[PDB]
Design a protein around this ligand. Structure first.
Ligand SMILES: CC1=N[C@@H]2[C@@H](O)[C@@H](O)[C@@H](CO)O[C@@H]2S1
Ligand SMILES: CC1=N[C@@H]2[C@@H](O)[C@@H](O)[C@@H](CO)O[C@@H]2S1
Lengths: 562, 563
């Protein structure tokens, strides 16, 4: 109820001429590849009344329906039935419905070659786009001449018996039924493990400070964790493996609407001794582990974007700053002290094996000077970098994440896989496509996971799960970057089109891995070669002969035939 | 001549040898001007049609397509046409243009089939070669094994040709020897169609001179530039073109086309507060088009350019600066009054003021009203035009008003506008799947457009791009926006399109319908007027699904030619 909301005003006026051949309200299955605009009729010639889906046991699969009306429709609703198949059933508890709601977005930089740098919103276009999966609001009133998408997620349980299942989606308005769309689902005799058991390394950096701000509650209070639980569950259920921690004040110098505070207390006592306390850090880590996010903790950062380190100075009873750089003796002395304490603490908690000291796009020289400090503190501290490819760092880094344009050699990837290291890629503001801006094509998000599979990478990294702007449900623009850069989940614990398509891609990554292990076990070199040539579609420079949407849909069909 | 020869793009569709196994020898036949014959398949013709019966008025241009398809390589394919003889009287072969109907890359409507608007990545759509370019320049072509090639034949019938039946021969040669002699019969009736200069039909196809200077890499408005444009724009004059496009400021459409329109007027702000304006480009362009026969109207774009940022040469900084200002602002009014008052004097001095329209493209109501006030304050007699949405409020203020096809003026509104000497037309753009002139549109759609003007008692038709060429217009007609072919209808080398030739035939029939009604009103002929009018009801934009554009057009041609 407190999560109900109003969308922003459409910056595009509705054109009555576009709506003149719409005589009655129209209800049809649509496509999960499409963001239907609010102010235009759905681009669908013909009412498609049936939907054929194919899926594995355990898989989450989705479909979009669409409603558009020349008249006002009050209290629009859709329920879905059980899915029946002779004697066996998929309960409707396993089916989430939501209204695909509209958020303000912009566009790429004026040149079309990137989306990096500061922005005044006045200098760019402004539109509404369908991105939010609103599973909370039970009904909506559609105005005259407007369109509204409906997202339907089907969670197929593990125990479900292989066969063809039939079901009904019932759209109502004003208290009366407008249409019964049919839904067929072919469940195959192959099982997809739960999210907890997926190999895919998904790192989407979390900002707890954005949630405390938006809801105006005290950080790390009961209320704060209660609001974050379903929100972060979305991340766990997409296969999230990495817990973000800020072990010092402002690791990214407040580049986001909400700055990261320190989850560690840095106390310099007046007698030369230090006192460190990890109570916040521990509560945050324990909380995320509880949700199923447990493979890695990434601590930002020893090389924060501004080289100014906050500490509580007891002598003056105040916050002071140490200005110090990697390569300075004072920098080393300051960090050795903390890291040696942090190391003991982490071993006592049983988290040391998984805890990485983490850096974001720092230069070569600084990384080398920083590594020396780290190794001197503890030889077994794990380290991560999301940044530029450097042959010099391949052995020192346990999680190495590289821009999409750059590549590890297959030799380098095998050695890294063999040694239990993690090897991923990212996109950021640089790359017009593929990306997860609110205006990006939905299939782009899915494409990202397939690209991991083509490159034999472990997964994918993006720098902002939920670094919300002021009013994230209404307006996704920020003072920097393309709109949507800073988040992919919304308040109320509402998923995005982007995150659901990414999750589907991740599921197919897992399927590709399971099929290859089976085909290596049998003698099946025909199947391996075929899968591998489907995967060559996911090259960042073959997007102009084969579009992301075409690529994805081709490859889905292929894997689902095996 | 030689510098206009070119290679087509690679076919995105592979040729299938199985489709060609029942083709034993090369085949030559008359075809249809309603059809774009695919390159990679044999012509869909199960019998060689050796004769072609055409009917035409004196003065009329009439066409026919022949088709050649071959299982083997044919070197130096050529076709000449003879004189057409009829007892003692003759139509010289100088009056007959032949061309190879050549292939251009195209796409398709938006995925839904309901429009063709919006930005596009070419990866997201189909890609095919389609027959559109009438190549009258290249004298021969070498056909590869398993391919089809259409040939367009335009017969310009002179005024004063004597009424009767004319016989003639089309001779197709290859490798230096004759493959076939197709026969061509032409029934010339005892009714005469005036030259293009005398057609009532108001055809406005906006011209882009900047595309021609770019593509040939020559200096804009130089001798070479005008020489390349002369035959190119002749195609427009000879289709009945009435309107000269002028850009009186920098980028009136904010570079929506591959080549942006630059300003044909120099806007110099001197450092002492005075302005200097020079119209030398504007004048040379206008004089040049008037010389070709395009003289009824000049349309100057625009006071409401698509981005409200007006360029001027700032002398004080010796640089280009921009004024950001909107209709309804005092600064906007001051900036334009100054220019328009100078422009008005200039236009009167040249004798062009009566025909010069300040022109706008799809702008809102409020902005048009605020802009009109500025215009009227500059000069009360400035004429104004709008291609856009129907608004009752603007009917008196606009001397040329062009409305989307989906919207309609009342017959009362059309009579008042005709009575006052105002012009009243319609357009299609990217919105309308049919009828249109995309490179994939059915050829008859182009002709249907002119008949639709005749059904609605409109003066003519407007389209927004005669020649706003993409990078390689002969090869690939796709653009970063819209259906392929939206941005142009004539090609480099001054080559017509299937689209423009069919549109021209439709325009000719518009003129014939007008002449027959004036005769039938003058006689007592109520039977004929009622019949013509019921033929015309076929050209309704929502009767296309019971009667196809091709069927409509051919039906109506027969009917008019019986009278
Ligand atoms: C791994 C990354 N690190 C940087 C982040 O801190 C943000 O600045 C982001 C903006 O798109 O760009 C890159 S992505
Ligand atoms: C009268 C017209 N004006 C507009 C033009 O400037 C182009 O944008 C065109 C694209 O199809 O659409 C409409 S048609």
């Amino acid at each position: 109820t407190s999560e109900y909301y109003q969308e922003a005003a459409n910056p595009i006026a509705t054109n009555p001429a576009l709506w003149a051949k719409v005589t009655a309200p129209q209800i049809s299955w649509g496509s999960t590849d499409i963001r239907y605009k609010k102010e235009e009729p759905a681009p669908i010639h013909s009412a498609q009344k049936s939907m054929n889906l194919t899926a594995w046991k355990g898989e989450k699969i989705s479909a979009q329906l669409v409603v558009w009306t020349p008249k006002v429709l009050n209290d629009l609703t859709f329920m879905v039935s059980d899915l029946t198949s002779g004697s066996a059933t998929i309960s409707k508890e396993n089916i989430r419905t939501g209204f695909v709601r509209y958020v303000i977005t912009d566009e790429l930089n004026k040149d079309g070659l990137g989306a990096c740098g500061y922005r005044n919103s006045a200098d760019f276009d402004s539109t509404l786009v369908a991105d939010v999966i609103d599973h909370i609001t039970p009904t909506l009133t559609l105005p005259a001449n407007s369109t509204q998408g409906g997202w339907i997620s089907v969670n197929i349980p593990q125990g479900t018996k292989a066969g063809k299942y039939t079901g009904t989606v019932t759209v109502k308005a004003d208290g009366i039924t407008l249409s019964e769309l049919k839904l067929n689902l072919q469940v195959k005799n192959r099982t997809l493990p739960p999210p907890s058991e997926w190999a895919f390394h998904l790192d989407l950096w979390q900002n707890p400070y954005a949630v405390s701000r938006y809801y105006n509650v005290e950080p790390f209070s009961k209320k704060h964790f209660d609001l974050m639980r379903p929100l972060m569950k979305l991340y766990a259920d997409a296969g999230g493996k990495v817990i973000t921690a800020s072990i010092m004040h402002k690791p990214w110098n407040g580049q986001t609407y909400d700055a990261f505070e320190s989850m560690v207390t840095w106390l310099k006592k007046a007698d030369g001794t230090w006192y460190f306390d990890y109570t916040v850090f521990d509560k945050w880590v324990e909380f995320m582990m509880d949700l199923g996010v447990k493979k890695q903790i990434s601590c930002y950062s020893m090389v924060p974007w501004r080289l100014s380190f906050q500490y509580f100075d007891q002598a003056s009873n105040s916050f002071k700053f140490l200005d110090a750089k990697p390569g300075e003796v004072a920098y080393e002395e300051f960090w050795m002290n903390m890291l040696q304490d942090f190391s003991k603490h982490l071993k006592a908690k049983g988290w040391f094996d998984i805890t990485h000291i983490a850096m974001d796009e720092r230069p070569m020289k600084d990384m080398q000077e920083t590594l020396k400090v780290i190794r001197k503190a503890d030889k077994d501290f794990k380290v991560s970098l999301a940044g530029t490819y450097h042959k010099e760092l391949l052995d020192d880094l346990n999680d190495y994440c590289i821009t999409i344009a750059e590549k590890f050699t297959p030799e380098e990837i095998e050695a890294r896989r063999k040694a239990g290291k993690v090897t991923t890629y990212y996109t950021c503001c640089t790359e017009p496509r593929p990306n997860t801006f609110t205006f990006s094509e939905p299939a782009e998000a899915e494409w990202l996971a397939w690209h991991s599979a083509k490159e034999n990478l472990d997964g994918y990294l993006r720098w902002a799960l939920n670094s919300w702007v002021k009013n994230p449900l209404q307006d996704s623009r920020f003072t920097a970057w393309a709109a949507g850069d800073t988040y992919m989940i919304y308040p109320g614990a509402r998923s995005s089109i982007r995150l659901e398509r990414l999750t589907e891609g991740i599921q197919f990554f897992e399927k590709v891995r399971i099929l290859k292990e089976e085909f290596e076990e049998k003698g099946n070199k025909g199947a391996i070669k075929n899968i591998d040539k489907t995967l060559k579609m996911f090259d960042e420079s073959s997007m102009d002969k084969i579009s992301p949407t075409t690529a994805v849909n081709k490859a889905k069909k292929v894997i689902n035939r095996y």
